[PDB]
């Protein structure tokens, strides 16, 4: 789009760095609706597990806010404690570090999920 | 006579003239043509001299195509000059032609007058040429 490609114009370097480097990847999604997260391990192409904001516990109605972004920080972290890495890496993915992007992120540091 | 209006470089090598003319070999614009059968070089005043023999012999009409074009520079050393003091200056221009290359073409002319016109032309040329028709 004018929207979907200009963020994939920004989602370019870390896209292909972590496949060169073979480390953990956090393929999140944000929108005006939602704030997602989903993790890929240290090989560029392995899905760990999925955890949406379409998950059973917090579909209460204010879904996808900065209130509802800190709920996601300990959410996929438990799904990545069956994985086995302490640190985890940050897909910017064209999602500028000012809102729900960091609030999923910085709530993982308390939620057993280091950066 | 016939030069390029400009060239990228003022000098070329000597080169060679091998192969056949698989391109430039069909009568592409006229009905009759003077096709070369031996290889050689045409010094751009062989081009014009045969051109003036053609246009003068028809005397009424017809369209004449010049398929050859002298494009490469040829350089001579003057007299009282030792070998190797830099490459000498350009003198004339030359088209490298192969066996089979169509030189001139004509239409609007009878087949008996075209043979008489290209025989005037071939006598001013240093080549072994032939007369050909349009094939398809």
């Amino acid at each position: 789009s004018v929207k979907k490609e200009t963020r994939l114009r920004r989602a370019r370097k870390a896209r292909l760095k972590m496949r060169e480097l073979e480390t953990v990847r956090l393929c999140v999604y944000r929108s005006s609706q939602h704030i997602y997260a989903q993790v890929i391990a240290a090989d560029g192409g392995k899905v760990l597990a999925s955890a949406s904001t379409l998950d059973k516990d917090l579909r209460e109605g204010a879904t996808g806010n900065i209130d509802a972004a800190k709920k996601v920080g300990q959410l996929v972290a438990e799904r990545a404690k069956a994985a086995g890495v302490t640190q985890v890496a940050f897909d910017r993915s064209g999602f500028k570090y000012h809102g729900r992007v960091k609030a999923l992120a910085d709530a993982a540091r308390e939620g057993g999920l280091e950066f | 006579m016939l030069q390029p209006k400009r060239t990228k470089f003022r000098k070329q090598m000597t080169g060679h003239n091998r192969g056949l003319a698989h391109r430039g070999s069909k009568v592409s614009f006229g009905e009759y043509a003077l096709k070369a059968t031996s290889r050689g070089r045409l010094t751009a005043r062989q081009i014009e001299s045969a051109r003036r023999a053609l246009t003068r012999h028809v005397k009424r009409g017809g369209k004449i195509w010049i398929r050859v074009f002298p494009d490469k520079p040829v350089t001579k050393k003057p007299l009282e000059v030792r070998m190797g003091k830099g490459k000498g200056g350009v003198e004339y221009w030359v088209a490298q032609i192969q066996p089979g290359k169509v030189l001139y073409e004509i239409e609007g002319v009878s087949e008996e007058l075209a043979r008489e016109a290209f025989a005037l032309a071939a006598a001013k040329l240093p080549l072994a040429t032939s007369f050909v028709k349009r094939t398809v």
């Binding site: - | 056949l20 070999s25 009409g61 369209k63 239409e107």
Partner: protein, 188 residues
């Protein structure tokens, strides 16, 4: 139009080059269709007498290797650049229900009675002969007539001004490239 043909069970550069100088033969193939191509040897004496005819290329030409016979078309003949004899005739087959592109020569009939030739002094300028068409094989014409009995001094007849057998698709009108087929021009 019938051609005799044979089997040609040896291929290559030096083999094909010694058919021409020892045996006097030409190599050829038939390939067209959804079928297997076949290498064919053929005589230079008879393929030049076929190319003598004005309708050699735009005509269904019969061919036999042995007792097998095909409705064959001459598609993209090859030629010696220096001496102009045929090498490698290169034929087609005919599957009788597709479009079978070929070249069809032109006539330019009315050149003596022309309003740019008679009253105003001008001469004709053949720009294009042998237009390439695409036509179903029963409507495969030998000729396409070009009428020049109304073209004036300066008027250009194009392929848009063209004509006949009406079941013959001209390949150049299928695209926006409309070609100029003849002129009448002032004399030099």
């Amino acid at each position: 139009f019938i051609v005799n043909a044979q089997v040609r069970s040896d291929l290559g550069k030096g083999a094909s080059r010694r058919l021409r100088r020892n045996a006097g033969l030409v190599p050829a193939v038939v390939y067209g269709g959804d079928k297997e191509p076949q290498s064919v040897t053929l005589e230079l004496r008879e393929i030049a007498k076929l190319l003598e005819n004005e309708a050699a290329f735009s005509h269904v030409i019969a061919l036999n290797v042995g007792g097998v016979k095909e409705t064959v078309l001459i598609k993209a003949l090859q030629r010696h650049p220096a001496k102009g004899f045929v090498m490698h005739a290169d034929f087609l087959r005919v599957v009788a229900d597709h479009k079978l592109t070929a070249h069809v020569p032109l006539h330019f009939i009315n050149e003596e009675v022309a309003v740019g030739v008679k009253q105003a002094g001008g001469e004709i300028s053949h720009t294009i002969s042998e237009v390439e068409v695409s036509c179903l094989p029963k409507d495969l014409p030998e000729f396409i007539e070009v009428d020049m009995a109304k073209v004036e001094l300066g008027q250009i007849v194009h392929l848009s001004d063209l004509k006949a057998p009406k079941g013959v698709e001209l390949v150049q009108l299928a695209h926006g490239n409309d070609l100029a087929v003849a002129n009448i021009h002032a004399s030099r």
